[PDB]
Amino acid sequence: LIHSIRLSSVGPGKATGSDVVHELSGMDLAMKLHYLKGFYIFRSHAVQGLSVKLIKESTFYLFNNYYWTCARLRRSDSGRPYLKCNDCGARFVEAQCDKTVDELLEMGDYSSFPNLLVYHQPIGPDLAFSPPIYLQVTWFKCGGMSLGMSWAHILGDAFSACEFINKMGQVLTAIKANGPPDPISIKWVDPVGDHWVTANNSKMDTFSFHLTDSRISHLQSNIPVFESLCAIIWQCVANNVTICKKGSGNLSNGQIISAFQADFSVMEADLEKLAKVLCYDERSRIEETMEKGNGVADYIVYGANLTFVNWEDADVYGLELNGEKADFASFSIQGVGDEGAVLVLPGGKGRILKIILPEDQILKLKTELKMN
Amino acid sequence: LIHSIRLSSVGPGKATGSDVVHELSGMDLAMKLHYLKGFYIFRSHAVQGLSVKLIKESTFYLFNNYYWTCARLRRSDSGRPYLKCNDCGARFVEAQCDKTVDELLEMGDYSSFPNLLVYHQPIGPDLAFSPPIYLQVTWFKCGGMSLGMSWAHILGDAFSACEFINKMGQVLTAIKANGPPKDPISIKWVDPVGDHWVTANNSKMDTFSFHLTDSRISHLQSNFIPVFESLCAIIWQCVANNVTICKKGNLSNGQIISAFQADFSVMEADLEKLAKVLCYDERSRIEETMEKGNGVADYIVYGANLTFVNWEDADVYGLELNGEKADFASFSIQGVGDEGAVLVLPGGKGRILKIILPEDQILKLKTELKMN
Amino acid sequence: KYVKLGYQYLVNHILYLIIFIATVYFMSKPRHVYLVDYACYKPPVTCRVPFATFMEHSRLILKNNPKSVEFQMRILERSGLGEETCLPPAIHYIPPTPTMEAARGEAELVIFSAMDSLLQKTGLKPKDIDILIVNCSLFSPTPSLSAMVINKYKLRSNIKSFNLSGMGCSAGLISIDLARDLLQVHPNSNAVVVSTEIITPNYYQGNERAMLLPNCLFRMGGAAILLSNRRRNRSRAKYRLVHVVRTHKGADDKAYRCVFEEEDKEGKVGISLSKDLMAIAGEALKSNITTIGPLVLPASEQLLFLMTLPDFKQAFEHFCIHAGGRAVIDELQKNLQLSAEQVEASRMTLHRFGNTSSSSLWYEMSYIEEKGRMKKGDRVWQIAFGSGFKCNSAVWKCNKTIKTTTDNPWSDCIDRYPVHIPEIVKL
Amino acid sequence: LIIFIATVYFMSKPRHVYLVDYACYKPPVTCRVPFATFMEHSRLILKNNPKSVEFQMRILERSGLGEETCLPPAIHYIPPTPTMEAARGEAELVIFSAMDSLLQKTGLKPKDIDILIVNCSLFSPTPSLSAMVINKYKLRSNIKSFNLSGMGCSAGLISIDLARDLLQVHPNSNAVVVSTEIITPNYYQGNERAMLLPNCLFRMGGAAILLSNRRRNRSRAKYRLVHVVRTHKGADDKAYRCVFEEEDKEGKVGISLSKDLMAIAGEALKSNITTIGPLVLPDFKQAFEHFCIHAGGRAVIDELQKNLQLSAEQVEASRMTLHRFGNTSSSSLWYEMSYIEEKGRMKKGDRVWQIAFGSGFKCNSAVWKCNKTIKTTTDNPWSDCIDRYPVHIPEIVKL
């Protein structure tokens, strides 16, 4: 499917100076085992006039503002990791696809897109030589182009990654036009050393589906859209529950994390019960927990307690090449604990729900939704 | 055993000139399905200070006298083959052997030596691009050297090939010293082969070599100049009608070839009787039948009947490098007919007997001969 | 021996009714050769190669040869290179795949950029170029690089074009000397000298430690120089060529083989460096200095030397030591007792642009010019060295005080570049 | 009044440049490659490309090459395996043989060589070939050495012109010019037809020439250089790209020739003649006794003979050099010269016009004058075949 893969490096066009570092906060360290995969697919009309040279130049000018995303991980004497800004760069991948964009979008099974259009390698087992950003550009027969990013969650959250990609697009356009410029939401896991990967007892699988405005309104028979959908999926999955929404340019993990522990029967509960539960910030607790460990202990956020993620506010379609939005853009989490996760993404009139569980639970959920 | 094989071409140092040809007689055409494989093995002492460059130079100066051995086969208007002396050359092969000369000379039977130390390809299926001579030089780990030659029988007989190799050695030494200078019964008609001159056998021909000493010769003679005659009689009795004898009579097919049809049963015949019938030339009739076919018909000499070849007088140990004869030299025929052949070679005071027969008959003879 | 060469040349140099005495001199004097101007190529920031990226790519490429990676780390830690040195695009891929298309692209980019800058600076018309000399050591396509320039700029059919290849990093001064002679022969003519090293074919794809140092040190760069003997250029010329001294230690077997292109055990071509490269370099530099001493030293120093049978800081105002290695600059500074400010241009050029083979002298000249330190009448000594172990030297005299400009390779970094270069760069 | 009219002329007079002698490399018979062997090796190598073999057959049939041209040892193996070691060995062999012959026949001491110019188009090791010569013969440290590379088959006359200028600058000096083409790295290992023609024609050869401006060589010199004219057609895109080194679809490097190549050559030649007509003419062929046309192709010799109305005797040296040695690149002109000297046809005062052409389509020519009647010798590459060599060359050589 994908052939002619070429690797190289990009990075800041301006040296940042020696001795520059970048501290990782408690939230950054609590997300060190998670990654973001985001891919955009454009047709030949939008990518007209673009070549790998232009994209590389735009990335070189983009990383001047995000030089720390090209840094490498070191460990202090106390063992707390940090980013040393040596301008090592981000990994750049060029790929070819024998299919066309029209053919690729006419498959229905988009579940393989994150694995083929995005190049991902975990940080480690040697921290000092693991880039936190992988960018892949794939060229199709019809002339369309795919842009995939693997983004280490230490750098920031999904909104930060979307801002980064939008800035890349803006810089490309500018170059073309004007010339060069105790908490519950986290779970302690067995130490992973320098290999930052989420360990899973079972084989996790992802299943995604789109819901329209009519479906959401009908399900809402009992702001409220996200809560109601979370309640529906929570009831079908059926104690600990985690929610993860947007907070209130700069790259940061500015995401509101909350958790609730329910000593009641979720299995047999009214929908309004779970809705009131969900709609009625744990940054401080996580910060203190990670500070008391000097950043050496390892925790996972996603998949800790059936995480719910609200990316309907994410600018997943903010990348405009030649003033045209991507034909199809999507985002997902790489690395999710056993409890799995649910992701809400901004579709059209409705929302796109991605659900990550063990395969047997995936089949059970598909059976449960076969009539609901 | 043999690795690092490199092919090349050698030939006359002086241009032969345009329109030069070389005619093939009736004997040459009758011999065209047979080839001679010879090889010589020298220890590291004899070939000291002898590189491939020197051997190639000596061959370049040798082929001036034998330019027609570098010719290529053509067919005239009537279809009679001849040799166009276009100086296309002879094939040269360079090979390496991990073993040493001592290991090779102390590993039992030398049955695979002709196959590995001699590079052989038949003439055809395209006559115009088939060299009649292949030379191969093998270098051993100890520093010893093997020289093998595959020689088309159209060029001459075993004595001619031995003279050619001895002249090669003489030229090499001189360059080192003074710098550069009625129906015939012996031949059987065979199915047409067109341009692929190979002897076709409806069986698996196999060889069997042994070293009858100067003592057992008299021991077998007492059972009843004609030494090879008595050996041929013994082998004829052991393998038991039609018999062929080849014996010694500038390169030419000068062999004296005779045949003797028999009516008395060979099995129940005295050894002296068979010796008498054996010891008591068919070139004229062979040439006449060849001319009656316009040189287009195909005939087989060796293996047409039970063939006995007398090479005891051939100068097998004639090649001298730095004044030292080959540690081990041997000659044999490739392309023997179904009937088989029995070659007698010199072993100093003794004889070496190479029998070529169908494998089952070889197994039978292995036991039949041991009784005497 | 080399003192004898210097004095032999000086005998034929100090030499340079009324009508006869005037004519016997005016018709035998050498023509003045003038460096009208020159342009240095400024590699784009998209080609920069920081230390960490180089070492990561080495770790990924030589994954099965840890000792080679360690050797490259040791070499590049003490090289004195900075974070802004550049390599051509083809070498940025994790396995580099050097093709002749990429080599031609890099050659066109560098050479055409330099030539465009030169023509814009001097107002020179292509039809006025009489001589063209191009020197690049390794890259040599069948239609010459000089032929490529002639095609690009449509030079005259009677252009005297020359392509010097395989002559190492000292061949820039060989080109300068050739232009000097050709301008002696041909009056009222212009010569253009292009000095460059295309890195894409120069890159070594094996893992032998003797062949990996050029990968660590050589970086992108190029220069185009306009020389003239026209009387009109005499006023606006930046420099006047005073001397060129050539030394060839190729007769000695050790010097001949100290930098040798050859295949390794795996059949990959690269430049092997000998263990005694430093001894050969010291001897060649000493021989060149001894030969040139008689031509530039004050008569006082020469008489002092002769009596006890000197100080070159008094013979020159500016020094341009080829940036072929930190150790060579160290040793020259130690032996000649040069101050930190007298080797500042060479060290800064090595830090900023790395080892640009034959064009580094012009980056050093640009560095001196952009600090406003090149005054009228100043004397500049350029010295270069390279394979065959040729060692060449040139002496220039500033013809007019040089005002700082903005179309130079140092324009965007000169305000800070007298920087501290640590002995060991920690990764 | 006499001084200002006499010394002005005497001081503005160019120095006389003399061809003291030259030596041509004689390839050994062990490197000989007849037509049949070339075609058989081509069949074995390009076994999967019958059309490439047919193209090479068609090219070599009408090439005008004989049976005694030579290729270096590395090219004799059925699949050639060119290595840098083999290229260095061939370069050393050819160049050292020619240099030894030159130093033996001139009596020139290596310490008396002031200028050394080496031109070889494709081969260019990091220690230049001039450095190799300096190391071999232990030349002076202040020698003016130059290595011209990538300038094609006309670069021999470029080397001659450079030596002429350097001898103008430097009085009482000797220049040695080594013109050669190493075939081992030149060989094309692919099967693209446009890049296969060079393999069919380029053969081993080399030349070492001693030039001087010393008065002691004014009487024993063979020739005096009269003129050198250079033409460059690189400004025209078609002429620039008509001989271009590049990779094929399989990534193998070779030299592609354009279909219009012949046309371009014609134009270049014409230009050169139009530039040298006013320098020698008082009808082009009546200004010269002898002609040396670079043996870069039978068709080019045919075209020049037709245009300049040359006779069979006047183009004899070029045709015989093409037949005997093939296309030896820049050294070709010196084999042809030797031919005229070996027939006893080079008399004092005779004018020789050499012309060469190559990549970028530079086209250069040189006019020499004979300084002394040259007697036949036995230390030249034609010695063992001159007595028969004015041979009949068939339009098509039948395999």
Ligand SMILES: CCCCCCCCCCCCCCCC
């Ligand atoms: C600031 C990021 C720059 C991204 C470009 C990096 C290019 C690296 C050049 C190739 C390094 C080769 C290392 C030696 C391998 C043997």
Ligand SMILES: CCCCCCCCCCCC
């Ligand atoms: C007489 C035979 C001498 C060896 C000829 C070798 C031919 C090599 C060149 C072929 C190139 C395809």
